[PDB]
Amino acid sequence: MGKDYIYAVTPLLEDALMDRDLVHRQTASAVVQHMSLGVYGFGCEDSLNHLLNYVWPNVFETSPHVIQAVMGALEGLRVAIGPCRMLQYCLQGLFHPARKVRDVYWKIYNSIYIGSQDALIAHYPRIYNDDKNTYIRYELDYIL
């Protein structure tokens, strides 16, 4: 029943996520998680993606409570919006040069792949064949 009020609470959560204190970001991450799990399957993915545009910069936090809230918000956003946008967010950082940044991105991608192992095949990026092995599948190019 929250879909009438998602657009009302969107700028409040947007102002809360930009706060200096980690408590506001953690509790707003819990807000995004419960709001994403609440009205899943109702077409409110634009405001959820807009909130994810503020949540996903906060993945570099080191405190355990706020990073647990960030992981729960990422799980709720991957349930609600879909694994395609999470794969789009993680594809440019899974092969990051930094060890810690690519480790955190690999943790998020491993959680997304545990949750969405079946649906990630159709949302896999279109990469051509290289010198190591063939990559472009010809079964998807078949038309009947």
Binding site: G43, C84, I121, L140
Partner: protein, 201 residues
């Protein structure tokens, strides 16, 4: 007219301004959702339909106040659903004589379905309440959720499946009485509403 929307392997729909008089080709609109669209049925000038390789029907409209002579602009997905089979073709034309001018899509598995746009908000709310009652009253035989099955590839958005509405009329009489008490109506009135929705075409 003055625009061509092409379905690629990665992008579901890319709209290029067909300036044949100016002899210039500029891509007016792009897309962010990756889909191997194998069908096209434009409901409007800015609306493009796509049938992905994983059997997902996605109708995406362009953003309003978009410049025709520009680029790097995305189109929001107005509706997205999973039909349960690989959709081959789609045409925005009335498949029945009179009634509703819906869009008819034929799948590669032998299925054909019409997506009737509900122009009544009260009827859409009654259908949504009946679907929410039937998703808990009658579980699926496979064990998967109806919302999970209808949104396997991408999440669903403003799409109502008529299979659950047809299966609601095929339920037991105690379950139909419980569903009518949850919907605050009669089971014969719900059957008449489903018959009117079927005859709307």
């Amino acid at each position: 007219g003055h625009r061509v929307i092409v379905s690629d392997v990665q992008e579901s729909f890319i709209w290029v301004r067909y300036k044949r008089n100016e002899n210039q080709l500029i891509i007016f609109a792009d897309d962010t959702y990756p889909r191997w669209v194998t069908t096209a049925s434009l409901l409007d000038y800015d609306t493009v339909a796509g049938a992905d390789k994983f059997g997902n029907i996605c109708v995406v409209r362009l953003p309003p106040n978009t410049n025709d002579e520009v680029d790097s602009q995305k189109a929001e997905v107005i509706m997205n659903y999973h039909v349960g089979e690989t959709v081959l073709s789609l045409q925005k034309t009335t498949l029945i004589p009179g009634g509703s001018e819906s869009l008819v899509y034929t799948t590669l598995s032998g299925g054909i379905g019409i997506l009737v746009p509900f122009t009544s908000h009260e009827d859409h709310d009654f259908f949504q309440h009946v679907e929410m009652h039937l998703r808990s009253e009658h579980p699926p035989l496979c064990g998967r959720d109806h919302l999970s099955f209808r949104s396997y590839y991408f999440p669903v958005k403003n799409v109502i499946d008529g299979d659950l509405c047809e299966q609601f009329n095929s339920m037991e009489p105690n379950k139909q009485k419980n569903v009518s008490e949850e919907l605050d109506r009669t089971p014969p009135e719900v059957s008449k509403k489903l018959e009117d929705i079927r005859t709307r075409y």
